[PDB]
Design a protein around this nucleic acid. Sequence first.
RNA 1: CAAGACGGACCAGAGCGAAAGCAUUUGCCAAGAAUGUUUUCAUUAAUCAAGAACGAAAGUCGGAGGUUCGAAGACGAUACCGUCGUAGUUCCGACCAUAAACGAUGCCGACCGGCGAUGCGGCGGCGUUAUUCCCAUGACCCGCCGGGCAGCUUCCGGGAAACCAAAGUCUUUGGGUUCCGGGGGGAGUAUGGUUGCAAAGCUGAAACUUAAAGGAAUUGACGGAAGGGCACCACCAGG
Lengths: 213, 82, 175, 25, 135
Amino acid sequence: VVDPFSKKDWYDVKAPAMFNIRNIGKTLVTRTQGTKIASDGLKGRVFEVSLADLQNDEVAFRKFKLITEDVQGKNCLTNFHGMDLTRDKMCSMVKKWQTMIEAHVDVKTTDGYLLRLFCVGFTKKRNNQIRKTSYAQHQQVRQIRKKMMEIMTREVQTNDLKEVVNKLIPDSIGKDIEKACQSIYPLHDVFVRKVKMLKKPKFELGKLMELHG
Amino acid sequence: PLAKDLLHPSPEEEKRKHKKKRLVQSPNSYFMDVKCPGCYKITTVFSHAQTVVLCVGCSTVLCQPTGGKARLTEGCSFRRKQ
Amino acid sequence: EETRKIPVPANRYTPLKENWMKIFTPIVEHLGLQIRFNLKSRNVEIRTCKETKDVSALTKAADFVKAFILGFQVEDALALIRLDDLFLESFEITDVKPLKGDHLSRAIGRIAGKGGKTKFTIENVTRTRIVLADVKVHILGSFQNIKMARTAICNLILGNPPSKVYGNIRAVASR
Amino acid sequence: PLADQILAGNAVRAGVREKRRGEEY
Amino acid sequence: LGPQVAEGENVFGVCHIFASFNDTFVHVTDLSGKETICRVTGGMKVKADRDESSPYAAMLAAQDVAQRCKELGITALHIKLRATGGNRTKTPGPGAQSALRALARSGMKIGRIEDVTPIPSDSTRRKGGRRGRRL
RNA sequence: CAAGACGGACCAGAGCGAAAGCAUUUGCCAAGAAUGUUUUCAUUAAUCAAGAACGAAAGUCGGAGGUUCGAAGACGAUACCGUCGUAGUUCCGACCAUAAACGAUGCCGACCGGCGAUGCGGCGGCGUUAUUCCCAUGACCCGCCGGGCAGCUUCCGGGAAACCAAAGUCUUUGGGUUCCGGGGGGAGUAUGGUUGCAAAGCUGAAACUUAAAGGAAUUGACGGAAGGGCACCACCAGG
């Protein structure tokens, strides 16, 4: 009988300090009428943001989940939650005459963000190869899966999520696995295809200021 | 075609054939004399040896068994015997 | 400036080379967009310019080359360009019945028919177009024509003989 | 072509038919 | 009414276009997806069960949501297509394409296309039997 | 957030297993084919009834769990469809031992074509990569050998033909050995025996009756069907 959108008001949401473009947009939130506060409904909102919307010259087929849990007076404040790949990239990247090798680890970081990695790689046809199919044997698959587990486990664990996120920005882990794993069977498209967030510690406000400015 | 002297095959076809399918069968294996680089002694080793053969004086690893021929250690010298 | 990118598979690369001319000439001449083939990522790139009107054609242009990705001929993709209501409907053969092994290949053969003729007949009946991929089936046409061709295909893979489907699809065409 | 087929199915044929019906000094 | 954003910059939303085989849903939300702006189904545009999944109902739905979001002030939307997913077909139908082209026909700026349908890794038994197809 | 299910894409002219069957990671356990072999025994072999092992799906008894699907069943429309849903589907423990369980094609052996692909093992050889790799080793490239898997083709010969590298080496008829058939019905019927709690399973007629029963490819015809063309001895608009 009466429109709810006149009651609604806008908040502005910014990106963390790892990212060149900080304007990630606006949010439509109800005002507080004494029953429920806008902050409590605004302290848990996940944003599926493309990388090209965060940096001008980066690629677009990597997406980041950023969780907003703080408000600062028409200023939404977010933090990292996860990372994934677009479905079209994942579908076009699985072509036929090759073997896909996929691995996962559960790992603890330096500041309590227990998290999981999923990475995928594909066998690569040589430049002079005349054979149609480039298949790796089972032992090569096990050795490759092992090696990507230790590489991704060591270059996530010893750093912080500032350095983890700035490693995921150009995906240095994937190209490092591609470089160090080419001696068993040469690989084709190595990316960390998914990062989960299994556990979080208690909320702190100073580290959000470090993550933002 | 349809005309070849089966009694007198030229040596490349006899070498090419499987060892049991030769006109008179002969093994592809041989015995070889190996010298360890850390010494001067000579050891007689089968080419397709299945057991690891150690030096009588140096006790070093001479050959490693593989699926076919044995893998001699980098450094050892060998000479085919007879 | 609006931008579209469409991936190309490896088996669609050579037909994209041999039909490139009749792909960019309908786009830049009487539709007016910017075309390129992003060779590193193997994508088709569509951009606007200062010579763009009737912005919806932009989206149409995307679907244009998308049809050529799916296996359709060039002229049918031009039919996406010229007409305003022309759609794509896609489904797998197993999405309607579980068929495994040789039964799936036999279902493919019933859709195609000997010499292709059965499949050919349905286009002349339904003014659609049909792409038979490995397991996928793509149908291009208006909504009622898509429905009619889809029903004909589903009956062809139920197990119904292709002669019965031929006769009944010639009959139902007259409405 | 699918566009040509739809346009021709939606239009009417016309033209060809020759009907034969019907001083200086 | 609307966001306090200058004329040069637009305001982004996202559009859940759920094209089932029986109808088509047009759900517009913000970047979070928690808060709702509009949602117009093929049943609310036609008073007939014939055209519930029609391209025409989706076209009317997209025009309605485009004019209502322009009334509110959202000038640009991201596009997220979805099919029925699961055991059933994974490809969006003609209703989704009709809604997409119709809301792009309104002159409203379009974002990036993401097709996230619930594709199962592996799933349970499908709705039909060992025998039955659609027809 | 939880509950069970299932291991898509990759996934194939593929691989493994006696067959039925087998696809998430990692660890453990005992098997195994092929290859390599100047190891060992020295004829230890082939085929075989009863019996034994495993034997898809469905199904029968105890439990656990019930997410989806779903015989029965209850509704609505019209035997085909939709809503809900029992047994079942899943796991463990005992049964039942049948499939178009197919190559509609006993097993062991000898001789007998072509092409270029593939899987594993072995052998030989220049080169390119491991951010020019500082030797090997992997990944490719070239060639050969041995068993496999599987295409395409063949004046090998065979066949009724479809076809077949065996379904060839067969009236120019004999490598070893097992089961099994003798025109169509009556009929897997009656009876006897045996197994199975049971359902059923193995074995199994005759009187009588009939001139057929059937196999392989090819179109000849064929009420009709879909397109056009002509006509005021057809139609439209009319007189």
